[PDB]
C-alpha cells in the first residue's frame, strides 16, 4: 500500500503483527482478466471402438 513508514510502524505496533506481509487489499499479484484459450480434454468414453453403450 501507499503508506508512510511512521504510520506503518504505528499500525504494526498497535496490531502486533506485520500488516504489509499479508495485506487484505488485492494488488497486481492477481491473475489477468484476459486469458489464453483453454482445451478442456474429453472424457473417458470418447473412444471410436469398443464403446458400446450397453456396457457403460
Amino acid at each position: 500500500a501507499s503508506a508512510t513508514r511512521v504510520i506503518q510502524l504505528l499500525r504494526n505496533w498497535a496490531s502486533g503483527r506485520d500488516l504489509q506481509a499479508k495485506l487484505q487489499l488485492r494488488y497486481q499479484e492477481i491473475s489477468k482478466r484476459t486469458q489464453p484459450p483453454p482445451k478442456l480434454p474429453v472424457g473417458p468414453s470418447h473412444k471410436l471402438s469398443n464403446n458400446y453403450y450397453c456396457t457403460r
Binding site: 473412444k47 471410436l48 471402438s49 469398443n50
Partner: protein, 229 residues
C-alpha cells in the same frame, strides 16, 4: 420359396451349373460323381482364374485341387513368378482374401476354405501380385457393393455407403489408426442383421483386408500424416 415362391406358388431356385450337371449325374450315377473330391465336397467344379496371371482362363477340374497347382497348371502361373504373389480372392468378391502364406497349401472345397476363414463361394479366383494397391482393389469392391444394393433395409444401405466412404478415405490414408477397429465394428454391425447375404458379402472383404493387411493400412496413414504434417 419351397412354400411361397414365384407368383405365390412353390418354387425352387437352382444355379445354372447345378441343373446343367444334374442330368449327367443321373445318367452316369451318383457314386461316380461322389468319387471325386473329399467327403462332403464331391464332384467337379468350374474355376475361373483371373487377375495377375499369364493366361486367365475357365477350366473344369476336380474339386479339392490345391490353389497353387490350379494357378500353375491351367492359368500358366502368376505373372513374375510365384514369389510375386501377394493375395488371392478364391470365391469372387464376397469371399475374403488370403495372403500368400495361407494360399501356399490350401485346397478348393467348402470345408478347407471355411477353415481358412474364407469359404469357397462361386470358385472365382482373382489373384494380385505384389505390384498392386490391394487397399485400392478392396475399396473398388466395396464401391461396387455400394452401387449394387437394393437399399430396402437400413443396415446394408447405410452401413455399406459408410464403409465405401471410409475405404475411399483409407486409400489416401486420411484417417487415424483408431478408425480401423471402428471399421471392423461397423462390419460386425452389418453382418447378420441384413435381409439377404449382400450385407454379409460386403462386410466380409473389409474384414479380410483388415485382418490380413492392417500393417499396410497403418503404414499408409502414417505416410499421409508425415507428408501433410
Amino acid at each position: 420359396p419351397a412354400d411361397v415362391g414365384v407368383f405365390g406358388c412353390p418354387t425352387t431356385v437352382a444355379n445354372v451349373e447345378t441343373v446343367a450337371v444334374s442330368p449327367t449325374i443321373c445318367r452316369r450315377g451318383g457314386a461316380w460323381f461322389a468319387s471325386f473330391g473329399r467327403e462332403r465336397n464331391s464332384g467337379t467344379k468350374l474355376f475361373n482364374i483371373s487377375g495377375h496371371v499369364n493366361h486367365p482362363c475357365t477350366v473344369e477340374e476336380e474339386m479339392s485341387v490345391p490353389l497353387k497347382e490350379l494357378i500353375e497348371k491351367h492359368a500358366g502361373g502368376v505373372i513374375g513368378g510365384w514369389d510375386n504373389l501377394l493375395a488371392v480372392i478364391p470365391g469372387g468378391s464376397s469371399t475374403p482374401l488370403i495372403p500368400k502364406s495361407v494360399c501356399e497349401t490350401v485346397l478348393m472345397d467348402f470345408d478347407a476354405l471355411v477353415q481358412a476363414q474364407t469359404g469357397l463361394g462361386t470358385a472365382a479366383v482373382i489373384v494380385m501380385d505384389r505390384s498392386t494397391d490391394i487397399v485400392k482393389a478392396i475399396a473398388r469392391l466395396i464401391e461396387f457393393y455400394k452401387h449394387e444394393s437394393c437399399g430396402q433395409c437400413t443396415p446394408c444401405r447405410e452401413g455399406v455407403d459408410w464403409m465405401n466412404k471410409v475405404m475411399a478415405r483409407f486409400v489416401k490414408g486420411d484417417a487415424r489408426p483408431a478408425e480401423i477397429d471402428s471399421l471392423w465394428e461397423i462390419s460386425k454391425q452389418i453382418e447378420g442383421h441384413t435381409i439377404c447375404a449382400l450385407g454379409d458379402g460386403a462386410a466380409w472383404p473389409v474384414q479380410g483386408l483388415i485382418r490380413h493387411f492392417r500393417p499396410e493400412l497403418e503404414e499408409r496413414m502414417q505416410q499421409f500424416a508425415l507428408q501433410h504434417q
